[PDB]
Design a protein around this nucleic acid. Structure first.
Ligand SMILES: [Mg+2]
Ligand SMILES: [Mg+2]
Lengths: 205, 203, 97, 175
RNA sequence: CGGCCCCCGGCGCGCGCCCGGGUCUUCCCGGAGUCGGGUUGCUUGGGAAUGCAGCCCAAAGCGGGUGGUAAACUCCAUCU
RNA sequence: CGCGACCUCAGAUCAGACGUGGCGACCCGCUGAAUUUAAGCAUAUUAGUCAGCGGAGGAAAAGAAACUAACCAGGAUUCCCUCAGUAACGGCGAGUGAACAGGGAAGAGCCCAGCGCCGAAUCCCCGCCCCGCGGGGCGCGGGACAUGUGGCGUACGGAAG
């Protein structure tokens, strides 16, 4: 059943497979169906934008992916706390809330606190009957457009430092090398043992 | 603070003051019928922390289940199979006995939706269970809009689909790496999702 | 001198010191509840795997009295939270006398 | 007995809580006065007995109670079994009365399983302060007399006469 | 494109309910024959048992679950 | 003994309601073989599928972490692309074989028991009339449930005074 040189093959068709198959003869029909549910939804509601709330800025989980920025889930309260808005007020204003999200940095915390007040800067509200509790005049002179698109404040913005040019100094060109890693790794798998060999000198008495 | 004392006293059922009336009403239930109507839940703390509210509408059956895993219903043990399939006597029936108790308690009453249930006794052969029920069409349950979630007709027969507290313990689902054996919906929905051939249109 | 491998790994970032979450506090003793479970070991009693366990703990062996709870309560680390509080109730039944 | 407990069901009877035909018309004379008179406090203390386990249990671990009238038969036997040891430990007295349906008619309900006292009227305090001594004589002075005790373990009258007949044939042999 | 008939969601009088916010002080704070362990059957890619079920043993509260090689000690991480 | 309060119970062509049955394309729970492949064949495979049995709906199931991670941390579920025919399993033979990352579709969150305060402030039925359609209500009086605990505030993101 095999012949002259070729791949060895395990094709997974020993199981019954012709009674579960899924031809996508409706994937054009499902694309222009779920465009009607974006046409006749984003006009049906409001001058509120399409594509949902403001999402915060979020840095990725894998070592592979920690260098990059992603539209996360919700500002996890603290960003509602340093910026100072009420949590059940926030999700009717148009601000997403994700309570099980934590903050264990101060660098990333203020990165959304300015973002939230920046959203609150570019927000205009409609008071019901124009007595205006804590909203200004005529509707920002007008609503200027009907709907906004693909995210409020461009949630990617994968910005990068310029770091233009420098003069190599004395300390920078002599030290920071490969041997600073082989001894760095040697204080990762020869550190706990050297805690134990100093216990040998405290029991030598 | 009363129910916290009822809870913690009941949660020590090998001391001598507990295992007297733990077993004097194992006998007192074994002389009644197989399924039965108790007029009031014989451990009141547990039934209401599962959702009992002592008013018009709810009804609390205790029923009996014989213990033990299932014997394979094949005549004279002749399973007629390959030698990994001669399992007549050592088979264990992957749905729990507490949910068999909720089934035939909900099977007898066609017009009673079931909330959930709990454990009230064991002999060596019998394993008793109260089962607390909810009448859908009573007007004290069709009002009270925190209970109108059960008069909705998608909650017909929450056992034979397996949607109670005890039944869904045996469905295998949950979150985590321990339960991604069933990662889509239910156990035989992931088997459709993995083991189908998802050829595209521009394949 | 940041370095991604070694002992001091990773990008140097400042750390927020903040009050811990309220689900993180689960099993604090909370005096109201200690009053319940101390009232209840004189209205209910002990079990017959620990009526025997103290009468091996007061006299003969404490390795084997651990190794008797080890067999009859699940793990080894559950049996070092039974043995050294079976002895404590036995202490306050002995040294309150 | 039925004799010492005669007073307790008659002392408590004048602390019966507010029934239907007087709850309907206490709201009214407070309303007919509210648009005319402006009275500050009609009921500064309600002389009343509390009902039910989940009220009487809390009112001992705040020591807000005077006396605990506790019943005999409950749907769940345990429901009650901690409440003697709880009131002895705090020090509020308790007495066990006959029938959980005899004290149920102190309150116009079927079965109420416990009633207790928080504030008796101080002009009839001495009726309380005469029999609360005999209550804590019978129970709270006798905790390690009542805690230790075991029940049952007595044979039937047909299976004890055949035991006691064997005592004749030994006390005949010693004659 | 009109005219003709019937039904949809959204004016305004008479209905009906109707004080939230920040700091400080004190107080409260949780689901048991369940969790887990021993064994047995099924099952999974889950491999020194991933899930499930039976039977036995049966918890604690700075406790418990998880951290993909059995285990003891030692921190920590996350979760309730 | 007679009367009464309850507790566990019966009886009815009592008043008023309810459930069974059919279809089964998709969905949910359970029980579930053999032909076939291994060039034989017992483990394995075919397969947790065919058949059998029970449950429903216009969708169902799932769901607001007893999670994934181990770094600059993500953040309910479901679905598609990738992860990947990879880790791993297997007479380590034949063969079966996930998930996290990452990009998209949609993106909605919440309730209670318990610990506590409010004099059960709760609900059903019955009769009258308010007054309105094809009826449902706040009023007015009478029987129940319920203190073995109804209703308000309350849910771990903290809450209460
Ligand atoms: Mg009833
Ligand atoms: Mg239909």
């Amino acid at each position: 059943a095999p012949s002259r040189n070729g791949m060895v093959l395990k094709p997974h068709f020993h199981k019954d497979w012709q009674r579960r198959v899924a031809t996508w003869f409706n994937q054009p029909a499902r694309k222009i169906r779920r465009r009607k549910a974006r046409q006749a939804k984003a006009r049906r509601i409001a001058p509120r934008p399409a594509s949902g709330p403001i999402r915060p800025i979020v840095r990725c989980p894998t070592v592979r992916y920690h260098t990059k920025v992603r539209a996360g889930r919700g500002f996890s309260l603290e960003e509602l706390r340093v910026a100072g808005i009420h949590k059940k007020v926030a999700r009717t204003i148009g601000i997403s809330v994700d309570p099980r999200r934590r903050n264990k940095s101060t660098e990333s915390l203020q990165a959304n606190v300015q973002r939230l007040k920046e959203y609150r800067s570019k927000l205009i509200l409609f008071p019901r009957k124009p007595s205006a509790p804590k909203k200004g005049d005529s509707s920002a002179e007008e609503l200027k457009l009907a709907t906004q698109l693909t995210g409020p404040v461009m949630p990617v913005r994968n910005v990068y430092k310029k770091e233009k040019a420098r003069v190599i100094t004395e300390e920078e060109k002599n030290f920071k090398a490969f041997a600073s890693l082989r001894m760095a790794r040697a204080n990762a798998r020869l550190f706990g043992i050297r805690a134990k060999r100093a216990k040998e000198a405290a029991e030598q008495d | 603070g009363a129910y916290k004392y009822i809870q913690e006293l009941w949660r020590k059922k090998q001391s001598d003051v507990m295992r007297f009336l733990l077993r004097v009403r194992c006998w007192q239930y074994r002389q009644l019928s197989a399924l039965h109507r108790a007029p009031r839940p014989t451990r009141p703390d547990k039934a209401r922390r599962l959702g009992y509210k002592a008013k018009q509408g709810y009804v609390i059956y205790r029923i009996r289940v014989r213990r033990g895993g299932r014997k394979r219903p094949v005549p004279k043990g002749a399973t007629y199979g390959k030698p990994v399939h001669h399992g007549v006597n050592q088979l264990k029936f992957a749905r729990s006995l507490q949910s068999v108790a909720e089934e035939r308690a909900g099977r007898h009453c066609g017009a009673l939706r079931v909330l959930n249930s709990y454990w009230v006794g064991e002999d060596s052969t019998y394993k008793f269970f109260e089962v607390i029920l909810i009448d859908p069409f009573h007007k004290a349950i069709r009002r009270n809009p925190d209970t109108q979630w059960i008069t909705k007709p998608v909650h017909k027969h929450r056992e034979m689909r397996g949607l109670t507290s005890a039944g869904r313990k045996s469905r295998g689902l949950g979150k985590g790496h321990k339960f991604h054996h069933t990662i889509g919906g239910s156990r035989r929905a992931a088997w459709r999702r993995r083991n189908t051939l998802q050829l595209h249109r521009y394949r | 001198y940041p370095m991604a491998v070694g002992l001091n790994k990773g990008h140097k970032v400042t750390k927020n010191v903040s009050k811990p979450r309220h689900s993180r506090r689960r099993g604090r003793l909370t005096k109201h509840t200690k009053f319940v479970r101390d009232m209840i070991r004189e209205v209910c009693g002990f079990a017959p795997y620990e009526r025997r366990a103290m009468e091996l703990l007061k006299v003969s062996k404490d390795k084997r009295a651990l190794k008797f709870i080890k067999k009859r309560v699940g793990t080894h680390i559950r049996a070092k939270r039974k043995r050294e509080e079976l002895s404590n109730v036995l202490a306050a039944m002995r040294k309150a006398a | 007995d039925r004799q010492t407990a005669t007073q307790l069901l008659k002392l408590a009877h004048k602390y019966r809580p507010e029934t239907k035909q007087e709850k309907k018309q206490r709201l009214l004379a407070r309303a007919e006065k509210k648009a005319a008179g402006k009275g500050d406090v009609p009921t500064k203390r309600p002389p009343v007995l509390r009902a039910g386990v989940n009220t009487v249990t809390t009112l001992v671990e705040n020591k807000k109670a005077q006396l605990v009238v506790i019943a005999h038969d409950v749907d769940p036997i345990e429901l009650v079994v901690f409440l003697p040891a709880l009131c002895r430990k705090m020090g509020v007295p308790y007495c066990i009365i006959k029938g959980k349906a005899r004290l149920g008619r102190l309150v116009h309900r079927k079965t109420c399983t416990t009633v207790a006292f928080t504030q008796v009227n101080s002009e009839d305090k001495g009726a309380l302060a005469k029999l609360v001594e005999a209550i804590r004589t019978n129970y709270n002075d006798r905790y390690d007399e009542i805690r230790r005790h075991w029940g049952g373990n007595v044979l039937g009258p047909k299976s004890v006469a055949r035991i006691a007949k064997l005592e004749k044939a030994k006390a005949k042999e010693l004659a």
